[PDB]
Design an enzyme around this catalytic site. Structure first.
Site, PDB file in Angstrom:
ATOM      1  N   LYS B  23       0.827  -1.194   0.000  1.00  0.00           N
ATOM      2  CA  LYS B  23       0.000   0.000   0.000  1.00  0.00           C
ATOM      3  C   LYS B  23       0.869   1.256   0.000  1.00  0.00           C
ATOM      4  O   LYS B  23       2.090   1.207   0.177  1.00  0.00           O
ATOM      5  CB  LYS B  23      -0.903   0.023   1.232  1.00  0.00           C
ATOM      6  CG  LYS B  23      -2.375  -0.105   0.950  1.00  0.00           C
ATOM      7  CD  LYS B  23      -3.192   0.408   2.128  1.00  0.00           C
ATOM      8  CE  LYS B  23      -3.088   1.920   2.242  1.00  0.00           C
ATOM      9  NZ  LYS B  23      -3.728   2.450   3.479  1.00  0.00           N
ATOM     10  N   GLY B  24       0.224   2.400  -0.214  1.00  0.00           N
ATOM     11  CA  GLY B  24       0.958   3.653  -0.233  1.00  0.00           C
ATOM     12  C   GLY B  24       1.474   3.985   1.155  1.00  0.00           C
ATOM     13  O   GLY B  24       0.733   3.911   2.143  1.00  0.00           O
ATOM     14  N   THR B  30      11.620   2.375   0.502  1.00  0.00           N
ATOM     15  CA  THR B  30      12.692   2.140   1.462  1.00  0.00           C
ATOM     16  C   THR B  30      13.194   0.705   1.369  1.00  0.00           C
ATOM     17  O   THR B  30      14.406   0.457   1.304  1.00  0.00           O
ATOM     18  CB  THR B  30      12.194   2.442   2.873  1.00  0.00           C
ATOM     19  OG1 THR B  30      11.648   3.765   2.911  1.00  0.00           O
ATOM     20  CG2 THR B  30      13.341   2.341   3.871  1.00  0.00           C
ATOM     21  N   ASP B  52       6.807   3.579  -9.469  1.00  0.00           N
ATOM     22  CA  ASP B  52       5.954   4.382  -8.612  1.00  0.00           C
ATOM     23  C   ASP B  52       5.764   5.746  -9.265  1.00  0.00           C
ATOM     24  O   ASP B  52       6.755   6.392  -9.624  1.00  0.00           O
ATOM     25  CB  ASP B  52       6.619   4.503  -7.232  1.00  0.00           C
ATOM     26  CG  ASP B  52       5.753   5.200  -6.200  1.00  0.00           C
ATOM     27  OD1 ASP B  52       4.572   5.470  -6.480  1.00  0.00           O
ATOM     28  OD2 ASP B  52       6.268   5.484  -5.097  1.00  0.00           O
ATOM     29  N   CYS B 272       2.670   8.161  27.234  1.00  0.00           N
ATOM     30  CA  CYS B 272       2.730   6.733  27.530  1.00  0.00           C
ATOM     31  C   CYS B 272       1.412   6.044  27.206  1.00  0.00           C
ATOM     32  O   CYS B 272       1.403   4.932  26.664  1.00  0.00           O
ATOM     33  CB  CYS B 272       3.103   6.515  28.996  1.00  0.00           C
ATOM     34  SG  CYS B 272       4.846   6.812  29.373  1.00  0.00           S
TER      35      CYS B 272
HETATM   36  N1  LIG Z   1      10.689   1.971   9.650  1.00  0.00           N
HETATM   37  C1  LIG Z   1      10.481   3.285   9.378  1.00  0.00           C
HETATM   38  N2  LIG Z   1      10.525   4.222  10.356  1.00  0.00           N
HETATM   39  C2  LIG Z   1      10.319   5.531  10.101  1.00  0.00           C
HETATM   40  N3  LIG Z   1      10.056   6.021   8.876  1.00  0.00           N
HETATM   41  C3  LIG Z   1       9.982   5.193   7.806  1.00  0.00           C
HETATM   42  C4  LIG Z   1      10.196   3.748   7.998  1.00  0.00           C
HETATM   43  N4  LIG Z   1      10.066   3.175   6.787  1.00  0.00           N
HETATM   44  C5  LIG Z   1       9.792   4.163   5.895  1.00  0.00           C
HETATM   45  N5  LIG Z   1       9.749   5.363   6.506  1.00  0.00           N
HETATM   46  C6  LIG Z   1       9.472   6.669   5.867  1.00  0.00           C
HETATM   47  O1  LIG Z   1       8.106   6.711   5.446  1.00  0.00           O
HETATM   48  C7  LIG Z   1       7.999   7.328   4.163  1.00  0.00           C
HETATM   49  C8  LIG Z   1       7.284   6.385   3.207  1.00  0.00           C
HETATM   50  O2  LIG Z   1       8.178   5.328   2.862  1.00  0.00           O
HETATM   51  P1  LIG Z   1       8.226   4.786   1.351  1.00  0.00           P
HETATM   52  O3  LIG Z   1       9.328   3.758   1.259  1.00  0.00           O
HETATM   53  O4  LIG Z   1       8.219   5.991   0.441  1.00  0.00           O
HETATM   54  O5  LIG Z   1       6.783   4.073   1.262  1.00  0.00           O
HETATM   55  P2  LIG Z   1       6.080   3.695  -0.143  1.00  0.00           P
HETATM   56  O6  LIG Z   1       7.205   3.723  -1.151  1.00  0.00           O
HETATM   57  O7  LIG Z   1       5.492   2.325   0.116  1.00  0.00           O
HETATM   58  O8  LIG Z   1       5.055   4.788  -0.341  1.00  0.00           O
HETATM   59  C9  LIG Z   1       9.413   7.611   3.671  1.00  0.00           C
HETATM   60  O9  LIG Z   1       9.679   9.017   3.742  1.00  0.00           O
HETATM   61  C10 LIG Z   1      10.325   6.876   4.626  1.00  0.00           C
HETATM   62  O10 LIG Z   1      11.486   7.655   4.918  1.00  0.00           O
HETATM   63 MG   LIG Z   2       6.979   5.140  -2.818  1.00  0.00          MG
END
Ligand SMILES: Nc1ncnc2c1ncn2[C@@H]1O[C@H](COP(=O)(O)OP(=O)(O)O)[C@@H](O)[C@H]1O
Ligand SMILES: [Mg+2]
Ligand SMILES: Nc1ncnc2c1ncn2[C@@H]1O[C@H](COP(=O)(O)OP(=O)(O)O)[C@@H](O)[C@H]1O
Ligand SMILES: [Mg+2]
Lengths: 327, 325
Positions: B23-24, B30, B52, B272
């Site tokens: 999903k988005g 990442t 994407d 908390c």
């Molecule tokens: N484990 C994590 N903890 C904190 N932030 C994260 C983590 N994984 C991804 N992100 C952040 O969340 C955002 C969305 O991640 P992304 O890889 O772009 O998701 P998608 O490509 O599925 O839309 C990115 O800016 C990334 O830096």
């Molecule tokens: Mg993406």
């Protein structure tokens, strides 16, 4: 020969008509024909509405007047209006359905449009439809809805376990099973509206299609596609408008004889222009004969002349409409 | 149970294409960048391809990424790439209106041909959100339907088409335009048939499904997993991203808070309680994940971090967590 009158006067004579759709490929004169039909219908009918679902805003340019998303009266008429038209579990399921079944959004937009038009209370509506390709999908809407229902049913079948297991967790407005039933109800609303609308569309008393083309292959080919599709779906068409005919009055035999007799008496430039115009006339005649082969037995075939000016503005539209309804 | 890492992806040295779906916002980009960084160690040449819609690859690597393989700063063998009258034109437009998705299928066909000729050892695909990737899986059916439509049109309007071919001489032959559209469909279908034969071979292709401990993410993950199973495409890796302290269980902090909540200042008490409620919810959904998968999938839990995982070093640390926990 005896044949239907080569005009659209039969449209004005059939006073019971509620929906007049104007179709054809891009640039053949759908909008012009629609505006002229509206102008002519505004005489006898109490209230006439023009609806444009063609993506651009060609209606405003046609009438030389800004047209709004809701019925805009036309300057110079008292009874002629025009109208131009362009977390959450349920939201996710609806998005998934939109991605799975291309065209369901078009079906829902058309349903909403039909509800708004049928509540606007007009005596007759003229639809300036989008180019042929898009209108054919409009015709396929019932199939699109049936596939959307099948997708939602398959989804329930395949993911009922997960959906029920999640229902216990999320409270308030995010029950997945309720979201699925709500999506079914929205599909049902859309289908019921479109079924009523289609029952009205299959009645030659209330609905007919005017197909516009020009004397060239692509236009006539798209016209034949549209005619066969309308026949498949039980929608009546008995009017073909062949637009932009290069002086429909004179005959190619007549001008060919004149040119072969008197060409060499013309300056070279005038001679070349006359020869080009004659060849264009011969080709157009080939395609108009093709139109009369395909239609003419069952269709009123209206020939409209090519003009130097764009048919914009009320006065021009009125003159064009007079040519359209009695040549 | 399988090891809770993506090391099995690195171990299978035969893999040619690794697709990353979800999903988005769950962490597709990442995870894709981290898989590419890790594969660049064992494999000679590694390519990252982003289908994407947005330009998320540039934001991920903190560097403009080009439309063709752009080497990544700090790497010798890792490249990335982000991706965006006339009778024939009229017939193709008619086909596009009749068969929605044919243009996407042809764009994907050209993309796959270019990738297969770039000659890389492994390609990691950062796909678009689940809804579009499912259509990607349906592309061969769309091509067959487009072929069937063009043939039906040929059958029904051959008379008109030939009679017009007799009229207009030289080029702009409508029958030739129809044969040309059939040939373009055939080119596309040949590319996509090769690609789909490679997709159904677990030796060469596998899918990594990314989600977060929430209902909608897991629901789309289940949709994607079942769709891949229908089309004979292998997936045996689930990445549950953004897990709120994956080590500890909510039980411990729940006992602590219920014992000692009222002794905290207002701000600490409130944060908390919020953290505990989120952790309880996430634990329900992670248990759901282990119910659905875990028997047959490597289930990798990745912690939620305070900073966005942008930049090469962030990607390196995240990748180490991804392949060896
Ligand atoms: N484990 C994590 N903890 C904190 N932030 C994260 C983590 N994984 C991804 N992100 C952040 O969340 C955002 C969305 O991640 P992304 O890889 O772009 O998701 P998608 O490509 O599925 O839309 C990115 O800016 C990334 O830096
Ligand atoms: Mg993406
Ligand atoms: N018989 C005609 N002669 C010359 N020009 C015309 C004729 N009919 C329409 N036009 C012009 O051609 C253009 C396209 O017409 P339009 O009605 O917008 O076609 P469509 O709606 O099918 O795209 C318009 O600017 C119009 O003024
Ligand atoms: Mg128009």
């Amino acid at each position: 020969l005896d044949l239907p009158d080569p005009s659209l006067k039969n449209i004005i004579d059939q006073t019971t008509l509620q929906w007049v759709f104007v179709g054809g490929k891009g640039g053949v004169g759908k909008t012009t024909t629609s505006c002229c039909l509206g102008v002519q219908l505004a005489k006898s009918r109490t209230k006439v509405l023009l609806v444009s679902t063609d993506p651009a805003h060609n209606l405003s340019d046609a009438f030389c007047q800004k047209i709004g998303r809701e019925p805009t009266p036309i300057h110079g008429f008292d009874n002629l209006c025009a109208m131009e038209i362009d977390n959450d579990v349920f939201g996710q399921m609806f998005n998934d359905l939109q991605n799975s079944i291309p065209g369901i959004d078009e079906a829902m937009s058309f349903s909403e449009l039909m509800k708004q038009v049928q509540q606007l209370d007009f005596d007759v509506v003229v639809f300036d439809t989008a180019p042929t390709g898009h209108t054919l999908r409009l015709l396929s809407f019932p199939t699109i809805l049936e596939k959307a229902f099948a997708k939602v049913w398959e989804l329930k079948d395949r993911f009922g376990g997960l959906i029920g297991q999640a229902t216990a967790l999320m409270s308030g407005g995010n029950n997945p099973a309720a979201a699925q039933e709500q999506l079914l109800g929205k599909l049902e609303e859309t289908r019921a509206v479109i079924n009523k609308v289609n029952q009205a569309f299959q009645d030659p008393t209330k609905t007919t299609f005017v197909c516009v083309c020009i004397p060239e292959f692509l236009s006539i080919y798209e016209t034949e596609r549209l005619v066969q599709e309308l026949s498949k779906y039980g929608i009546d068409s008995h009017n073909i408008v062949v637009n932009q005919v290069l002086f429909p009055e004179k005959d190619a035999e007549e001008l060919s004889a004149w040119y072969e007799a008197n060409g060499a008496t013309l300056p070279k430039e005038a001679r070349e222009i006359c020869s080009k115009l004659l060849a264009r006339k011969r080709m157009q005649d080939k395609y108009i004969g093709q139109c009369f082969d395909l239609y003419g037995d069952d269709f009123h075939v209206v020939l409209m002349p090519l003009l130097d000016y764009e048919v914009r503005g009320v006065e021009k539209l009125k003159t064009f409409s007079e040519l359209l309804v009695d040549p």
